[PDB]
Design an enzyme around this catalytic site. Structure first.
Site, PDB file in Angstrom:
ATOM      1  N   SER A   1       0.838  -1.201   0.000  1.00  0.00           N
ATOM      2  CA  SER A   1       0.000   0.000   0.000  1.00  0.00           C
ATOM      3  C   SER A   1       0.870   1.246   0.000  1.00  0.00           C
ATOM      4  O   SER A   1       2.008   1.229   0.478  1.00  0.00           O
ATOM      5  CB  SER A   1      -0.920  -0.007   1.229  1.00  0.00           C
ATOM      6  OG  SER A   1      -1.576   1.239   1.374  1.00  0.00           O
TER       7      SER A   1
ATOM      8  N   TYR B   1      -2.992  -1.227  10.311  1.00  0.00           N
ATOM      9  CA  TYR B   1      -2.939  -1.558   8.894  1.00  0.00           C
ATOM     10  C   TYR B   1      -1.631  -1.142   8.234  1.00  0.00           C
ATOM     11  O   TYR B   1      -1.012  -1.929   7.516  1.00  0.00           O
ATOM     12  CB  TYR B   1      -4.122  -0.866   8.205  1.00  0.00           C
ATOM     13  CG  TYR B   1      -4.179  -1.113   6.711  1.00  0.00           C
ATOM     14  CD1 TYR B   1      -4.572  -2.329   6.168  1.00  0.00           C
ATOM     15  CD2 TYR B   1      -3.825  -0.080   5.843  1.00  0.00           C
ATOM     16  CE1 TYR B   1      -4.617  -2.541   4.798  1.00  0.00           C
ATOM     17  CE2 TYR B   1      -3.865  -0.270   4.476  1.00  0.00           C
ATOM     18  CZ  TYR B   1      -4.257  -1.494   3.969  1.00  0.00           C
ATOM     19  OH  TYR B   1      -4.295  -1.640   2.607  1.00  0.00           O
TER      20      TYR B   1
ATOM     21  N   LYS C   1       1.667  -3.338   6.409  1.00  0.00           N
ATOM     22  CA  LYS C   1       2.171  -3.051   5.061  1.00  0.00           C
ATOM     23  C   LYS C   1       3.620  -2.592   5.146  1.00  0.00           C
ATOM     24  O   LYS C   1       4.438  -2.885   4.278  1.00  0.00           O
ATOM     25  CB  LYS C   1       1.285  -2.027   4.353  1.00  0.00           C
ATOM     26  CG  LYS C   1      -0.128  -2.503   4.031  1.00  0.00           C
ATOM     27  CD  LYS C   1      -0.128  -3.821   3.247  1.00  0.00           C
ATOM     28  CE  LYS C   1      -1.556  -4.166   2.832  1.00  0.00           C
ATOM     29  NZ  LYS C   1      -1.592  -5.379   1.975  1.00  0.00           N
TER      30      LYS C   1
HETATM   31  N1  LIG Z   1      -8.716  -0.626  -2.157  1.00  0.00           N
HETATM   32  C1  LIG Z   1      -7.772   0.221  -1.760  1.00  0.00           C
HETATM   33  O1  LIG Z   1      -8.060   1.316  -1.250  1.00  0.00           O
HETATM   34  C2  LIG Z   1      -6.370  -0.338  -1.535  1.00  0.00           C
HETATM   35  C3  LIG Z   1      -5.314   0.573  -1.353  1.00  0.00           C
HETATM   36  C4  LIG Z   1      -3.985   0.281  -1.085  1.00  0.00           C
HETATM   37  C5  LIG Z   1      -3.692  -1.056  -1.008  1.00  0.00           C
HETATM   38  N2  LIG Z   1      -4.722  -2.053  -1.165  1.00  0.00           N
HETATM   39  C6  LIG Z   1      -4.427  -3.513  -1.071  1.00  0.00           C
HETATM   40  O2  LIG Z   1      -4.962  -4.215  -2.199  1.00  0.00           O
HETATM   41  C7  LIG Z   1      -5.231  -5.581  -1.790  1.00  0.00           C
HETATM   42  C8  LIG Z   1      -6.672  -5.901  -2.150  1.00  0.00           C
HETATM   43  O3  LIG Z   1      -7.580  -4.926  -1.609  1.00  0.00           O
HETATM   44  P1  LIG Z   1      -9.047  -4.642  -2.241  1.00  0.00           P
HETATM   45  O4  LIG Z   1      -9.335  -3.187  -2.292  1.00  0.00           O
HETATM   46  O5  LIG Z   1      -9.144  -5.493  -3.441  1.00  0.00           O
HETATM   47  O6  LIG Z   1      -9.988  -5.332  -1.119  1.00  0.00           O
HETATM   48  P2  LIG Z   1     -11.435  -6.055  -1.164  1.00  0.00           P
HETATM   49  O7  LIG Z   1     -12.140  -5.505  -2.348  1.00  0.00           O
HETATM   50  O8  LIG Z   1     -11.960  -5.926   0.202  1.00  0.00           O
HETATM   51  O9  LIG Z   1     -11.019  -7.571  -1.431  1.00  0.00           O
HETATM   52  C9  LIG Z   1     -10.078  -8.259  -0.586  1.00  0.00           C
HETATM   53  C10 LIG Z   1     -10.253  -9.730  -0.971  1.00  0.00           C
HETATM   54  O10 LIG Z   1      -9.379 -10.510  -0.093  1.00  0.00           O
HETATM   55  C11 LIG Z   1     -10.165 -11.493   0.565  1.00  0.00           C
HETATM   56  N3  LIG Z   1      -9.732 -11.894   1.923  1.00  0.00           N
HETATM   57  C12 LIG Z   1      -9.551 -11.092   2.997  1.00  0.00           C
HETATM   58  N4  LIG Z   1      -9.127 -11.760   4.063  1.00  0.00           N
HETATM   59  C13 LIG Z   1      -9.129 -13.024   3.656  1.00  0.00           C
HETATM   60  C14 LIG Z   1      -8.762 -14.155   4.412  1.00  0.00           C
HETATM   61  N5  LIG Z   1      -8.506 -14.102   5.721  1.00  0.00           N
HETATM   62  N6  LIG Z   1      -8.693 -15.344   3.742  1.00  0.00           N
HETATM   63  C15 LIG Z   1      -9.050 -15.463   2.440  1.00  0.00           C
HETATM   64  N7  LIG Z   1      -9.344 -14.369   1.712  1.00  0.00           N
HETATM   65  C16 LIG Z   1      -9.431 -13.135   2.299  1.00  0.00           C
HETATM   66  C17 LIG Z   1     -11.553 -10.842   0.671  1.00  0.00           C
HETATM   67  O11 LIG Z   1     -12.555 -11.864   0.871  1.00  0.00           O
HETATM   68  P3  LIG Z   1     -13.919 -11.566   1.702  1.00  0.00           P
HETATM   69  O12 LIG Z   1     -14.449 -10.275   1.168  1.00  0.00           O
HETATM   70  O13 LIG Z   1     -14.660 -12.793   1.340  1.00  0.00           O
HETATM   71  O14 LIG Z   1     -13.492 -11.466   3.111  1.00  0.00           O
HETATM   72  C18 LIG Z   1     -11.670 -10.212  -0.711  1.00  0.00           C
HETATM   73  O15 LIG Z   1     -12.050 -11.194  -1.690  1.00  0.00           O
HETATM   74  C19 LIG Z   1      -4.927  -5.607  -0.294  1.00  0.00           C
HETATM   75  O16 LIG Z   1      -3.760  -6.290   0.070  1.00  0.00           O
HETATM   76  C20 LIG Z   1      -5.147  -4.183   0.120  1.00  0.00           C
HETATM   77  O17 LIG Z   1      -4.474  -3.915   1.345  1.00  0.00           O
HETATM   78  C21 LIG Z   1      -6.052  -1.692  -1.443  1.00  0.00           C
HETATM   79  O1  LIG Z   2      -4.580   5.069   1.270  1.00  0.00           O
HETATM   80  P1  LIG Z   2      -4.233   3.969   2.281  1.00  0.00           P
HETATM   81  O2  LIG Z   2      -4.214   2.587   1.743  1.00  0.00           O
HETATM   82  O3  LIG Z   2      -2.979   4.453   3.014  1.00  0.00           O
HETATM   83  O4  LIG Z   2      -5.350   4.031   3.398  1.00  0.00           O
HETATM   84  K   LIG Z   3      -5.966   1.631   2.177  1.00  0.00           K
END
Ligand SMILES: NC(=O)c1ccc[n+]([C@@H]2O[C@H](COP(=O)([O-])OP(=O)(O)OC[C@H]3O[C@@H](n4cnc5c(N)ncnc54)[C@H](OP(=O)(O)O)[C@@H]3O)[C@@H](O)[C@H]2O)c1
Ligand SMILES: O=P([O-])(O)O
Ligand SMILES: [K+]
Ligand SMILES: NC(=O)c1ccc[n+]([C@@H]2O[C@H](COP(=O)([O-])OP(=O)(O)OC[C@H]3O[C@@H](n4cnc5c(N)ncnc54)[C@H](OP(=O)(O)O)[C@@H]3O)[C@@H](O)[C@H]2O)c1
Ligand SMILES: O=P([O-])(O)O
Ligand SMILES: [K+]
EC number: 1.1.1.10
Lengths: 244, 244
Positions: free
Chosen positions: A136, A149, A153
């Site tokens: 992140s 969080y 990261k």
């Molecule tokens: N979206 C942003 O703002 C953002 C920004 C910076 C970094 N990131 C990173 O991008 C990655 C994906 O985020 P996203 O926005 O795609 O999130 P999301 O839309 O919430 O999806 C996360 C996925 O991971 C699955 N998951 C979570 N915990 C799990 C567990 N214990 N075992 C198996 N599967 C699990 C969730 O399943 P369930 O929903 O079924 O629990 C979901 O399918 C992460 O590592 C996140 O930290 C995201």
């Molecule tokens: O924008 P974030 O992933 O630092 O909350």
């Molecule tokens: K975030």
């Protein structure tokens, strides 16, 4: 630019939603064979309808014992995308033991476990491979209410470098990608309010949040042989947030 | 906390105003012998009147040849503070050759020249010493209209590191201090607009700008044998700006 993922077997964690789901989709469409790991079975069910031939695996990656029983029998995996995470936000003075534990078990301990399983199989076959860890923007910049969080990261960026060091002699590359907000469910649960979002927007030179597509593109580049001398790195997809 | 500066000979560049002037006074109070180098004579006249006993040297440090003639004959110098700098602010598309050249001659080439003179002398005498380079928070974070200035400070950070590397075997430590805005003349010309200071103030966790005394305190710690295993670093004096 060919990237040579057609045919390869790729494992994606957290593939039910958001970035992980769009990664599976992109990979399927190029020809790679995908193992989709996620917590919620209904997400996998729709995904196998949309992307015929992937292999779904439903397991909670926070549970070491259950993960080992579900993944141990996955077989040969060439490429690995560690994407699953949880975001449990709490002001520092309100952080609890349970939120800490859960966050570190999913966001970091699982990354070690799954990576070990895939790296042991690459070594046993004596072939090269690549791992991408989805980190992140806040692995390197603090955000209020994100102390736990952002520490996972920050820990993940460093884990990425030791992995890169210890796995480099076996020709396995390990890199992180570090996106800004992405309006997935995780981003929209938090940055949907016009004002909080605005304070972040003003800091992003390109003046917008990231799309899933931007993130996937970086993932695919770091998985492919096109990035053959890149390892231990943290690739920003944050519209220039880290620069100013 | 005894930092044992009394009795040593310290050279300070840009000693006529601001942080350099405050550094000379602090050192003068602690019994050190100070060589005060600055561009404007009247600045040194009143400095000698407030701090009797300092040796003023009046010279334009952007002039390699004049500097050599002015400083080649300055004597034993144990400690060095490279503080002189110019801030010529232009939008990137309006940067001129002249502003570039002048900024790099003063903010970096002079650092090399004066440090060589001091390091050569220390090595001849076979004694340990220490150098502090005054850098900036903008050495690692971009600010509009500061492309040249921020580049000189980014170059300075890295120069600090190579200096630390090559002079380490000679028991000479080299570190940088990286302040946020300070309300000297340099700070007052830019950040005096209330709307101006506001933009940056909201990004500083301690919610204020730095005072000269904060910068001096850091310079003194880094010059003292109290920081004996610290070399090649960039110590932030920016109220946490870099953290978020
Ligand atoms: N979206 C942003 O703002 C953002 C920004 C910076 C970094 N990131 C990173 O991008 C990655 C994906 O985020 P996203 O926005 O795609 O999130 P999301 O839309 O919430 O999806 C996360 C996925 O991971 C699955 N998951 C979570 N915990 C799990 C567990 N214990 N075992 C198996 N599967 C699990 C969730 O399943 P369930 O929903 O079924 O629990 C979901 O399918 C992460 O590592 C996140 O930290 C995201
Ligand atoms: O924008 P974030 O992933 O630092 O909350
Ligand atoms: K975030
Ligand atoms: N003030 C801030 O906001 C701030 C922030 C971050 C970092 N810094 C750094 O702190 C250091 C000092 O800044 P400051 O705010 O104290 O500035 P200042 O009040 O303008 O003082 C700078 C001093 O350096 C002298 N000087 C400049 N060019 C010179 C040259 N060519 N030869 C000889 N002497 C020269 C100036 O002399 P004349 O005035 O006679 O030319 C002046 O006495 C710099 O390295 C600056 O980059 C300052
Ligand atoms: O030197 P700056 O970063 O305070 O403008
Ligand atoms: K400045």
């Amino acid at each position: 630019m060919e990237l040579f993922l057609a045919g390869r077997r790729v494992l994606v964690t957290g593939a039910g939603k958001g970035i992980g789901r769009g990664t599976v989709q992109a990979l399927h469409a190029t020809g790679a064979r995908v193992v989709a790991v996620s917590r919620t079975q209904a997400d996998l069910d729709s995904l196998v309808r949309e992307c015929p031939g992937i292999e779904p695996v439903c397991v909670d990656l926070g549970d070491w014992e259950a993960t080992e029983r579900a993944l141990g029998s996955v077989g040969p995996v060439d490429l690995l995308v560690n994407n699953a995470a949880v975001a449990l936000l709490q002001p520092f003075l309100e952080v609890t033991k349970e939120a800490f534990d859960r966050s570190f078990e999913v966001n970091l301990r699982a990354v070690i476990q799954v990576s070990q399983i895939v790296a042991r199989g690459l070594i046993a076959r004596g072939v090269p491979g690549a791992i991408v860890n989805v980190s992140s923007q806040c692995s390197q910049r603090a955000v209020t209410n994100h102390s736990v969080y952002c520490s996972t990261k920050g820990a993940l960026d460093m884990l990425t470098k030791v992995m890169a060091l210890e796995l480099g002699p076996h020709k396995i590359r390990v890199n992180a990608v570090n996106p800004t907000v992405v309006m997935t469910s995780m981003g929209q649960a938090t940055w949907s309010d016009p004002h909080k979002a605005k304070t972040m927007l003003n800091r992003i030179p390109l003046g917008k949040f990231a799309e899933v597509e931007h993130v996937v593109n970086a993932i695919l580049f770091l998985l492919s042989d096109r990035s053959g001398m890149t390892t231990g790195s943290t690739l920003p997809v944050e519209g220039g947030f880290w620069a100013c």
